[PDB]
């Protein structure tokens, strides 16, 4: 397989505008949402059809109860943070947990928290400790590190349980996640040379420009890999032409183990 990942996010908002949830939690396999929960629906629900078809109602019922609890825990943790920061108004709290199964068979695991969108506490599952970015986090770090069994629990979840979930979901969604749709690549002028690719899956792609067989990333404008809306992606890269010298320009595209070169005449 290619590299794959599983991650769950949580978002807490302390004083949300009317209608918007104080708490949301979404799971992803790669770029695919698989699960959602929020404080308005109070239900955990699938976000991919291959999750709904392979997880029995007992699964959604049980994690719905756990997420009702995690929602309350997030409210209490955010209240404590905003009091220690002495902050008024609406502030955000975020959590991300997950793991990766690399192509070569190795694994990574990660867990971190953010306050107002900035890193706040970052877990190191090898040294079994929390990295704190300021003195509010330093206070939380001491409290969390006092509970050694919970650090051990998180290391086991990240290294064993998460990877097991990931391989289970990869099998459920294999027709989606393990397919390959090659890009359709074209070049035009607008003076700058544009190289445009669309129709591809997975979204991981590398497009670059070479001049006389040499690459120079400083001279290249790299566009983002964007969702096309139909399950595939598109990207582009541009480079400006030198009218003072004759040079051979070529677009190079790398996708899922295939390399492609488009020579500009």
């Amino acid at each position: 397989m290619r590299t794959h990942s599983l991650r769950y996010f949580r978002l807490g908002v302390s004083d949300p505008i009317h209608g918007v949830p104080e708490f949301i939690s979404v799971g992803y396999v790669d770029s695919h949402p698989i699960t959602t929960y929020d404080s308005v629906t109070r239900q955990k629900e699938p976000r991919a059809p291959w999750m709904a078809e392979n997880l029995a109602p007992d699964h959604w019922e049980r994690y719905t109860q756990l997420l009702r609890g995690w929602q309350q825990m997030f409210k209490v943790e955010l209240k404590r943070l905003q009091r220690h920061y002495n902050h008024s108004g609406s502030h955000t709290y975020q959590r991300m947990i997950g793991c990766e199964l690399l192509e070569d068979g190795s694994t990574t695991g990660f867990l971190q928290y953010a306050y107002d969108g900035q890193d706040f506490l970052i877990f190191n599952k090898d040294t079994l400790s929390w990295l704190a970015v300021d003195n509010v986090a330093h206070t939380i770090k001491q409290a969390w590190e006092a509970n050694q069994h919970e650090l051990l629990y998180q290391k086991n979840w990240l290294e064993e349980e998460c990877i097991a979930w990931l391989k289970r979901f990869l099998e459920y969604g294999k027709d989606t996640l393990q397919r390959t749709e090659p890009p359709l690549v074209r070049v035009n002028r607008k003076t700058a040379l544009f190289c445009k690719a669309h129709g591809f899956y997975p979204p991981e792609i590398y497009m670059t420009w070479m001049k006389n067989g040499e690459e120079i990333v400083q001279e290249i404008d790299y566009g983002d890999i964007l969702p096309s809306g139909d399950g595939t992606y598109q990207a582009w890269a541009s480079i400006e032409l030198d009218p003072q010298s004759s040079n051979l320009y070529s677009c190079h595209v790398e996708h899922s183990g295939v390399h492609m070169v488009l020579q500009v005449p």
Partner: antibody
Amino acid sequence: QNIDQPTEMTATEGAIVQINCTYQTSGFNGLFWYQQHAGEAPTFLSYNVLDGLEEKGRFSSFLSRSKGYSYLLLKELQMKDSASYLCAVKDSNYQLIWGAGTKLIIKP
Amino acid sequence: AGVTQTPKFQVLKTGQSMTLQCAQDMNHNSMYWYRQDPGMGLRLIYYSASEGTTDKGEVPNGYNVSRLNKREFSLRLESAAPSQTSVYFCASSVWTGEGSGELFFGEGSRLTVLE
């Protein structure tokens, strides 16, 4: 999902006894041991989630995740150790599966 | 006080109603009702992962529960049956969706239901 531990064990005061617990579960989020004196409430003894041995006073608890095996080790047995010992495992959905308990009888 | 459940003992005729009370003063979020029967491990009847939510356990038939507030979780036998003769334990923990946190048990309620 299944947890197994012997029904009853008898050892002598001052000696050592090892209470075994084997489990097969859908995933693993830790193994607990509880003590329950006859007619009383269970109380927490130990938690293991990574492999190896952990010590707490006269009690130690061992876990092997690959073997799906734990033991609770009681040394220098006293009459007050006569009780039932319950093993419990949290599975992938954080549900506790409970063993039926081992009744430990101590001979003075 | 920890976990306080009542009553310690109760005799019931088949069809009679009964409510078991449980309160915890440890500011725990999660509460549980178990039954204990000889020859088997503890079986969860209902649980309450947080204030304002409850759900069935493994043996919910014949029972209902009410999480009245953060402290209190009562168990109701609307129409007692002999099969509900058992010892009942209420328990609480700080949270449910975590790994290492232990349970704290009440003293137990011994119920005998007779025809």
